[PDB]
Design a protein around this ligand. Sequence first.
Ligand SMILES: OC[C@H]1O[C@H](O[C@H]2[C@H](O)[C@@H](O)[C@@H](O)O[C@@H]2CO)[C@H](O)[C@@H](O)[C@@H]1O
Length: 557
Amino acid sequence: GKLVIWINGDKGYNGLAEVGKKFEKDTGIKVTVEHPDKLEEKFPQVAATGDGPDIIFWAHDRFGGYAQSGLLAEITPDKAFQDKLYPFTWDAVRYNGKLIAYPIAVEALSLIYNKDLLPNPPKTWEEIPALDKELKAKGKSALMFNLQEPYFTWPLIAADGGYAFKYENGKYDIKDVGVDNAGAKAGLTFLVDLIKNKHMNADTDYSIAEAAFNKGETAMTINGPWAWSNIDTSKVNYGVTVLPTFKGQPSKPFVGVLSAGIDAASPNKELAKEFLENYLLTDEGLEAVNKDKPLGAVALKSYEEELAKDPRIAATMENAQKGEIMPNIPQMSAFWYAVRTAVINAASGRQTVDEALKDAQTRITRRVFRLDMFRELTDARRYWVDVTLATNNISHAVIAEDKRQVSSRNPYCTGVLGSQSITSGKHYWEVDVSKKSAWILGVCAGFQSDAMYNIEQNENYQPKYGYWVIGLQEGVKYSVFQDGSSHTPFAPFIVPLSVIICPDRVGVFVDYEACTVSFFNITNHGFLIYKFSQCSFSKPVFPYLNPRKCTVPMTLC
Ligand SMILES: OC[C@H]1O[C@H](O[C@H]2[C@H](O)[C@@H](O)[C@@H](O)O[C@@H]2CO)[C@H](O)[C@@H](O)[C@@H]1O
């Protein structure tokens, strides 16, 4: 019987505590609100060890990562409760068909301006440079906001067409990432120009922007609802308006639903539900918090209706309508981290915009960072790539909707390739074969259907026909599929591979420039199993995976 809640320092924690206090009054169990630094990164660490907060408050996008990691408990709330909050907020906090958090509030960056200093807010980004030069000649600046966090710079970047993950056919494609497109390069390019024109300074952080604006030294800032409190403290005449256009288009700011998740390890899930459902998520409760620091537009229809009266909230909503509510998938933290780095590198001059985004994009797209072993092996792992299988049909093998493993069917071609292709560089990935009777693992340059008919089913894989692969048969017989003699085209030359230990996991390493494809026995200290060398790479080449009608999954990595 206790509750520990974690919430950001930006947010109105004290207001929340007041809610905690009333909950304690009624039920006599203590509630503690803690607002620790970088709680978003800390939470997985502590929670996993068994001691983490019972309840955590953050924007929805992370929560997928948490949920996948199994740190979040599912929530059982009744149909009638669900009705009280908007269904789109619920969707934000839905992962793999399960609700993982309670939605609380909807937060969107707004353009905030000092009315006394500036009569009319800029409709366009492009006018702002002229304005700031006008303003400098009075010891003041046009615009200051946190450049360190990509949350604040994303809206401009997305304006002309930058995007994180392509959503199509009802699903986010983690591979189709638009950080490196024309639109994104255009947006970031404008910003770097502002910095090098001395209009804005690359170091400006949250505190700097906020201090400057509150002290009326800058005409504009960019921020969410939580910030309105401090500006009220400063007695500044301010408006909250729509973000300016870039290349004639709306700034598209990612929209967050502040959400309350329940630690999977919490002994007090039962208490947590009531607190959230019956105490916080009520007119009384949100008011408490909102009076401390503004929540934005709340999820609770009851109270939000009274909030919509505030013109500032309307402005928040207008910017949200122009933007996109964040994805909640696990890759969001890669996205963010990559963009965080690209922004500062470009603004500090340590990289060109075009570099920064190619860096950031490959980082997100392929090179995901998601001893006592063979040195070559550890070397190869340095180049490790994330791989998802591409569904192209039919081969009769089943693939998990995660696109990360494949097995056969009970009911003769079952063979599958990696979604992404290879034309340059070094790629490493691992495949879990454990507990499988048979399989073929290797690098496949394509089905090459119509190239010549046969290989798919009669299982002749020969480098000459573009298959560099090794195989398991009958539980303990391992083979390399080297290419055969001229007359014998149909059958591959099969070489007994001597493996001392059945590998539960195998590592495939492609150095495209080298024309080398190497196989490592992860189970057995990463020793080399086989290496195809001097192999013709005339074509893009993809990872190959064949269950070999095993009926047991081959999982990637
Ligand atoms: O900056 C990357 C960051 O963006 C979002 O964080 C926001 C948060 O949603 C707001 O509520 C407020 O506190 O500002 C934050 C940025 O300073 C994402 O929610 C977060 O996961 C991501 O790291």
